[PDB]
């Protein structure tokens, strides 16, 4: 996150860190807890390492430096990548992760609500993006979970800044005209949440973008409301 500030315990209790352990262990992506046994993230997080065994998922965590050899983590039982997602591209950039065991809820580990069928035409005005990504282009993974407030833009505005790509109705974009606040590398797969009628809703999944916090260069997010039939089918069907 560029231009953000430190989050607090309990502030974003759905935020998870998806890490890979080979010889060394590294944070690769964010994700969002959406049920006891379900995390929602970006499909692209699995382009390089598509197999489940190397992944470790940390929840109820503020500071990555708190992780030690003994820190408990969830494991991946199933990765469900959208059937129309193409590796390395921006369409249908969404994946469900089923955990090997269900997690209990606490005030520091609980789910983000998904958008409601009633809120199809809602214009969201208090939106935030979180993660442990770089605080500048070619920076470093941040220790304490960062947060930043970013306004949504229209798809037409977003398309003006991405002439080489197609912005679709299944994407949503967010950014400031003069830049300065944005997601960056390592935030991908994490949440874009907006507070509507007193509750937080998962509106986006951090997906792609050119640079970080550049002027007239919004971030692109998978628009979660457009995948609700798919989420409910894949989850209900699995359990």
């Amino acid at each position, epitope marked *: 996150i560029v231009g953000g500030t430190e989050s607090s315990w309990g502030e974003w209790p759905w935020q998870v860190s998806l890490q890979v352990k080979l010889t060394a262990q590294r944070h690769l992506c964010g994700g969002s807890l959406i049920g006891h046994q379900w995390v929602l993230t970006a499909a692209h997080c699995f382009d390089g390492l598509p197999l489940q065994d190397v992944w470790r998922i940390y929840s109820g965590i503020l500071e990555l430096s708190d992780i030690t050899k003994d820190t408990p983590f969830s494991q991946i039982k199933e990765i469900i990548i959208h059937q129309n997602y193409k590796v390395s591209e921006g369409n249908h950039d969404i994946a469900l992760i089923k955990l090997q065991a269900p997690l209990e809820y606490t005030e520091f580990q609980k789910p983000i609500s998904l958008p409601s069928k009633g809120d199809t035409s809602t214009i969201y005005t208090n939106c935030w993006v979180t993660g442990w990504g*770089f605080s500048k282009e*070619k920076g470093e993974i941040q220790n304490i979970l960062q947060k930043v407030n970013i306004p949504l833009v229209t798809n037409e505005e977003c398309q003006k800044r991405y002439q080489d790509y197609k912005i679709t109705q299944r994407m949503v974009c967010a950014g400031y005209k003069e830049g300065g606040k944005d997601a960056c590398k390592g935030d991908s797969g994490g949440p874009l949440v907006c507070k509507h009628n007193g509750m937080w809703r998962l509106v986006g999944i951090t997906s792609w*973008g050119e640079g970080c916090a550049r002027r007239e260069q919004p971030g692109v997010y998978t628009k979660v409301a457009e995948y609700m039939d798919w989420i409910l089918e894949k989850t209900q069907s699995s359990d």
Partner: antibody
Amino acid sequence: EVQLLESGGGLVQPGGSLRLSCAASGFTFSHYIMMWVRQAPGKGLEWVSGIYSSGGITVYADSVKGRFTISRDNSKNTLYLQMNSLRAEDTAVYYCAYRRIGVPRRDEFDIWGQGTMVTVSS
Amino acid sequence: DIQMTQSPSTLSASVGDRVTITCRASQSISSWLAWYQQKPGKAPKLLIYKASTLESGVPSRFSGSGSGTEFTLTISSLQPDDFATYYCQQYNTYWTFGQGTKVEIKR
């Protein structure tokens, strides 16, 4: 970050062979086009070989076609350049480079190694 | 082969100058053109790709324009770190580099 380290450079006689390696380190979800580029003493950069996807198009500059073979051992995370029938004019620093496939993800289009020196002389 | 020609071959400038370098392709390469900076004894560094997109981490004083066969790189205000050789690269068909433009200190 993702990092690239070349090795295998050295002194070889005309007609001899040499195999360069480029070992990739780090974790990434990105896929890459993989190239070898060289620079002779006091000269410009010259692209010589590439591989566009896993087991995909391997291609060569006319200057090396028929003498060089580019390959990947994914299990070792390593890119190779096998160089045969070497000649004086193949003398150069050899660099491996990765180029990002697909949409930008707040990340880099190019990754470059450090270079390894190859000297062909009798 | 697609041949790439840079001009000028050398150019002399001072800190604070606006500097422009041109690259010509022997046939159309659409916008598949990149620009690099290289210092003696070091690997080159990517500045600009797809003719005008700024690479991750590159300062905003660098910009590029053009499409087809004629391209420019501009350094809006030259800094001490910018004296170096610059190469264009077509990537329409494989890669081909231009011969380079050295940017040196005027006196």
